[PDB]
Amino acid sequence: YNPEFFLYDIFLKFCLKYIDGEICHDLFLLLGKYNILPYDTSNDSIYACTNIKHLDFINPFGVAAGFDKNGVCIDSILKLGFSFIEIGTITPRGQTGNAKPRIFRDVESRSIINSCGFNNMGCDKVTENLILFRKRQEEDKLLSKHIVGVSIGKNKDTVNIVDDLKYCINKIGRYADYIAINVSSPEAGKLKNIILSVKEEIDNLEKNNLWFNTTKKKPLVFVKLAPDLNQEQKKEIADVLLETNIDGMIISNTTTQINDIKSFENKKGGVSGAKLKDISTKFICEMYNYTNKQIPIIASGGIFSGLDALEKIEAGASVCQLYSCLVFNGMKSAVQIKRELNHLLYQRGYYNLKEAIGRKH
Ligand SMILES: Cc1cc2nc3c(=O)[nH]c(=O)nc-3n(C[C@H](O)[C@H](O)[C@H](O)COP(=O)(O)O)c2cc1C
Ligand SMILES: CCOC(=O)C1=C(Nc2ccc3ccccc3c2)OCC1=O
Ligand SMILES: O=C(O)c1cc(=O)[nH]c(=O)[nH]1
């Protein structure tokens, strides 16, 4: 409840009526590298503690993948009140991505469509940007216990999918609290291979040497699915996940099956925000049922209010990543939504958050 937030959250709602997305985004990215973005320091409520396997998130709210792709402000994004951030996605060979502009935001429908094309400075340049932080992380107080994952994918023209990840782990795997595979860009057996492929490198890091991360342990393997699949395709996947014994999924990414949005009729790419919430709260409640409550799930897909966030948990999401929230509601988005959830896990008579995971039977 600062003047600082509120002041920025005028500047920004201005941006969201007059400036391009990317431009606003790349501007506000810049400040936070020069550390002029307001902090959220006030201690969280332990009752909204949460974890996946052995991965402890001081609060449930992170910044989703593709927000800080190049990991250039990790600092001042986590010091807005997010437990964790997800950086990348990052390809072994860094890309300028599709031609601009490629990020378009709806202000009424609070929705975003992008054809970015995985623009990143490349696994090499990024790893160095993360390391420089893991250093900063020991010195600075306000980054103790804050989890950084890394999203990884394949180059556009890839020699082999697996070997593009393989380079990526090898480079960065030491400094991530989790690795995020994504197969969700705008069969099951080829997936199984990848997963196994990915665990193997992470199992090779441990043998050929260490963990300069926040856990100081080997990074968990999460896959980031997309909501545009059939039951058949889905259940065929779920089995792989249990077969791969996988550390967790990140339901979901950007849908492409939304054409009710006027401003976006002339655009191509995947949509994130309000119109993708519902779709993604049903995509947790299916991939929960099939894996039979055995795989931990990180929600992403139209989370804005503490209610929006609770709907994901009670579906089965042990954690919440925000992206569109920040675009629309702003820098208070952590402080506001966190306040909102505590006042809602109460209302509902949840003793703690972890009690409320998957309480849709
Ligand atoms: C402009 C833009 C870039 C994105 N880049 C990535 C990315 O590199 N890797 C990734 O895994 N997800 C990426 N996403 C997807 C988000 O991480 C998130 O899953 C999606 O936006 C849903 O969040 P929301 O509906 O809560 O905004 C991107 C989304 C947008 C709008
Ligand atoms: C590309 C995502 O959407 C934007 O461009 C956009 C945007 N994104 C960001 C990016 C980084 C941020 C860092 C800190 C606080 C808010 C932020 C908000 O804030 C206003 C706006 O228009
Ligand atoms: O960079 C992109 O095009 C991109 C990557 C991703 O994972 N999700 C998305 O919506 N866009």
Question: CATH code at 230?
Answer: 3.20.20.70
Q: Which of 350, 288, 275 is nearest to 316 (CA)?
A: 288
345 is a domain residue: yes
Tokens 């409840």 belong to 1
Q: How many CB atoms lie within 10 A of CB 53?
A: 11
Is there a domain that residue 360 lies in?
A: no
Of 346, 256, 337, the closest CA to residue 80 belongs to 337
Closest CA to 21 of 106, 98, 78, 99: 106
Q: Which approach determined this entry?
A: X-ray
**Nearest Cα to Cα of residue 286 among 354, 217, 229:** 229
d(CA 5, CA 341): 19
Q: Parallel, antiparallel, or unpaired: how do β-strands 103-105 and 111-114 relate?
A: antiparallel
Contacts of residue 279, Cβ cutoff 8 Å, sequence gap at least 6: 227, 252, 255, 257, 258, 301
Q: What phi and psi values does residue 337 have, to the nearest 5 degrees? A: -65, -40
Domain membership of residue 330 (yes or no) is yes
Residue 306 Cβ < 6 Å to ligand 2: no
Nearest to 127 by CA among 181, 77, 169, 182: 169
Whether the CB-CB separation of 110 and 324 falls below 8 Å is answered with yes
Which residues are part of a known binding site for FMN?
65, 69, 89, 224, 273, 302, 323-324
Closest ligand relative to 110 C-alpha? 1
Q: How many residues does the chain have?
A: 361
Type of residue found at 340: E
Q: Is residue 361 part of a domain?
A: no
Atom of ligand 2 nearest to the CA of 21: 5
* Cβ atoms < 10 Å from Cβ of 234: 17
The answer to the question of residue 192 being in a domain is yes
Pocket test for ligand 3, best of 69, 96, 254, 268 (most atoms within 8 A of CB): 254
Helices (H) and strands (E) in the chain, counts: 11, 13
From CA 361, how far away is CA 243, in angstroms rounded? Answer: 24
Ligand 1 atom at shortest distance from the alpha carbon of 114: 1
- CB distance 181 to 173 below 8 Å: no
Rounded (10°) angle between helices 21-33 and 3-18: 150
Question: Angle at the Cα of 270 (from 236 to 287), degrees rounded to 5?
Answer: 25
Q: Which two tokens stand for residue 77?
A: 């994004």
**Does 216 map to a domain?**
yes
Q: Give 118's DSSP letter.
A: -
Asked if residue 120 belongs to a domain, the reply is yes
CA of 222 to the centre of ligand 3 (A): 16
Task: Give the DSSP H/E element, type plus range, for residue 283.
Answer: helix 274-291
Q: Does residue 325 have its Cβ closer than 6 Å to ligand 2?
A: no
Indicate which ligand has the atom closest to the C-alpha of 91. 1
Tell me the C-alpha distance between 352 and 346, whole Å.
Answer: 9
Is residue 314 in a domain?
Answer: yes
The helix/strand/coil state of 62 is: strand
Q: Where are the beta strands (DSSP E) in the chain?
A: 50-52, 55-57, 61-63, 85-90, 103-105, 111-114, 148-152, 178-182, 220-224, 248-249, 270-273, 297-299, 317-322
248-249 and 148-152 strand pairing: unpaired
* Structure tokens that stand for 251 in this block: 């339901």
Q: Could you tell me the resolution of this structure in angstroms?
A: 3.3
Residues within the annotated binding site?
A: 65, 69, 89, 114, 116-118, 182, 224, 253-254, 273, 302, 323-324
Which amino acid would we find at residue 79? K
Q: In total, how many domains does the chain have?
A: 1
CB atoms closer than 10 angstroms to residue 155: 17
User: Is residue 104 within 8 Å of 176, Cβ to Cβ?
Assistant: no
Which domain covers residue 296, as residue numbers? 3-355
Give the CA distances from residue 294 to residues 43, 327, 343, in Å, rounded to whole numbers and listed in that order: 31, 33, 29
